[model samples]
Target: EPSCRFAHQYTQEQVLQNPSKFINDVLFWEGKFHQNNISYNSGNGMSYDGTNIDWVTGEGTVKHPFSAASKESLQVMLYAHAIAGSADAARFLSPNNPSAAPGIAASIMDTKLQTYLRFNETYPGFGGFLPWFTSSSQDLTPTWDWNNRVPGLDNGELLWAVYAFIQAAENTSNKSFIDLAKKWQTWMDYTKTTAAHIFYQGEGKVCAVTDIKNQSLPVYHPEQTYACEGTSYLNDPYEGELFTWWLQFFGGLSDADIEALWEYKRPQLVSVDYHIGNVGPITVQKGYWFSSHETWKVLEMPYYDIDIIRRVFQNAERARTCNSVVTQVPGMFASINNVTDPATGDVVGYISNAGIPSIANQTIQELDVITPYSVFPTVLFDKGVGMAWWRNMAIGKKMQNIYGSTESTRRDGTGVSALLTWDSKVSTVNAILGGVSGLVSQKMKAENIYNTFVERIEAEYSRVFKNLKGEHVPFCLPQETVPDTGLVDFTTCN
Candidate 1:
């Protein structure tokens, strides 16, 4: 409800009335990230991290030479770009030229698929993917530290991305992308002895990581089971154990086992004081602040509570501005605040959860950070609210002039962050591609990618059940409800 320092240039009416042009305008700046080659690439398909930019000049400044990118961030970029490619292709679709769209989409995905494939590595005994990549180079050899440990949550995100890639490729009817996705999907877990397989401890149990002893003559020890920290702050499916849900299909667990695990590791709620919305106080579903934004995952899993989903969004909308903390700028908020060395271009320090004023003993006045991806979620949950935030950010940050969204606007008011990433660059397109249903302006659906993912999952569901000689089980079932609590239980039919 509070107006940010930069006034809105495009009102909700403009965005609501002209969705196609809105998408085209977003794609124009997103295209600049790729054109500038900010995500450094190896001659082969490896894509490295991006640099921090100067706030006033909008130029990339610092190099995050040692920053390690997880599979979670990797897949986020890959899936988002693939969708951007499709949406760009869709822009030209017409009765006059039916043949042009597929080739166009395939070309864009092929480039992204190359970078997506590079982080994967295999040895004599076990295999999965490296969790961290250096910002300095496209080559991603593991450092001797915990970097050697590959977690299920990271691979699970990648697995979902691979599946999404398969669906989008199918939409384009491109065999190359589909075939590669199928092969990679199999390798995601490959055999019972693999890293992904090792992460699956037993029925309803998964370890956090499988630490590799040596890179060349690799031997692994699976560590950190989920049950130990089921009630921890990061226990939520959206954050830490995201891979667990996918395990039902990808990791070959029973439906009942997955359900039991979900109950065991359910995310709890935390009440935090804030001046985000007009409301005096608000409660959040603890884990990721953006848990509500991810209700889209419910399209695949039936158990995600609808009541919980709406409440989280409501709380978010009320305090979206973080009015008390960022008094100077009325920009949207999210949890990251990374600072880099201005001279050497190396990251000096960062706050992983800057948005949470309740945690980490941080002063709100010091956390004047604004990120667009956080605002991107509101586009689906509530477009009018989402657009207002977007226009303020676009005008505040000068996105058209800067090329892409700023990774994190710091304490200074000029709207410059120390780093820019592929993850942030594609959020605008990600929101646009995942257009809302029945909104006259929103033409795309995240379902374009999600529907095919469900189809493949259904086939896998049947296969897994048949192998065990078990009863025919439906994919979606009613989840148990918690009365009067924010959590709402619902059933799905497929």
Candidate 2:
């Protein structure tokens, strides 16, 4: 538990004893995550892989800078600040609040994020500018490759990150963030729908495709400006998921737009490659598309259709088709034959498969198991489901302590580490960047989610986690995860 490092020495205990005090007292104040994360930048911000370090003082550096406002992590801190604000909205605004304005971690998010804006504002040409979003560095531009399809103009990923930031930041009511989101909205011109198909297909849309192996049925994009083309169940309509439906409920999409996406977009891109058995009434298309959890835009829109919902449900179910995905066998591994080529008996569209990581021909990643999956359940179904997840995570042994370190990006149960979000799920980066503070805060209905989360920390770990001990936390599968594997609890998390 890094006992020598005072930050986490008794952090869990303090957070448990009194939730009201610890957040501002120990977790936010003494933790020094902000000090550790806010790297000394010359001016404009940049990226920081897990290797960066300078914790020589009392606790040694907490490594993993993750670029305060670079593309991916930038959104992480952006949403984090709003979460901090939401967690203690009054305190943030109050002059007499004990914590620093917006809290420490959040303040760092502000400066780092602002630094990125400063560069982009001063020089647009350097950091390639687009309608939906901006570039990471002074001379950067967003990548335009949509899902697994051919390369196109605007980067949906960049737009996804930016919009995710904007909506979540709105929770804070911060003027800078509001203005920034508004500007992005204007630039992206999402006037008709929350959709952002910022693509350029001058040569009759065919030009949108760079004649790559990822051939698709229509133009490279479904949305006019930004496209959701070539997506797998995993990488779909968006890059970031709704942290709190409140950020941009239904992702701020409209009815006509929602209809447009359901009819025209999502289904078409449901990968020709993978499909599990007809799970419930809906057929599960193995994704990068269907599973794409990062986006907030709808095909114009569809975090709502039965099929979309079915897929959403299926996605949770499918995230783990095998025990190995969450165990030592391999990372986030699951059913290989479930969605196989059949002819050759090999899984094509799946991101995580059985046995070893190489069997799937992909790097092992035990990512996206909790949070968004739990977030989806909590938002769609029950708060207890989320509470169970929180319990398992808190009384936990392997997580945070094991994976919580800067090097362990699985981020072992949750908490926060700049690396996991940068290395794993877009929704995760957006959510974990620090939004949980609000999601679990005193104001939200899901505060039960937070309270239960803290409860486990204080509750005797030996009591709540008897069977769950030593094994991966997913087994007991809190919140009926025991019985709901095929039901609403998708991530199978079990």
User: lDDT winner among the candidates?
Assistant: 1
Model 1, 37-134: lDDT tens per residue?
Answer: 45544333334456666533556555444333342344333342343355452432211343554543345445544544454443332354545545
Candidate 1 residue 232 C-alpha distance from true site, Å: 8.1
| Alpha-carbon local distance difference test for all models | 0.43, 0.30
Over all chains combined, what TM-score does candidate 2 have? 0.43
Per-residue lDDT value at 192 in model 1 = 28
- The runs of at least 3 residues in candidate 2 whose Cα sits more than 4 Å from the true structure, single-residue gaps closed, are 1-33, 36-49, 52-84, 88-114, 117-198, 202-285, 289-311, 318-421, 424-494
In candidate 1, position 117 carries an lDDT of 48
Instruction: Pick the TM-score winner.
Output: 1
Residue lDDT tens for model 2, 1-494: 12212223333334445434422321231122222232223233343322222211112233333232223333343444444454443232232553454444344445545654553454332222222222334432323432223222223344434444445555567676555556544543331132222222221121222222222222233422334344322212233222112112223444444344333333323322222232122222333322223222321122322333433333333333322223422123222112213244222332332222221223444343322222222223223332233333333222222122221112233221212223322222233223333322432232233343234222322222222111122222332121111111101111
TM per candidate = 0.66, 0.43
- Lowest-scoring 10 consecutive residues by lDDT in candidate 2? 485-494
Clashing pairs in 1: 4-330, 52-418, 52-419, 276-319, 277-318, 277-319
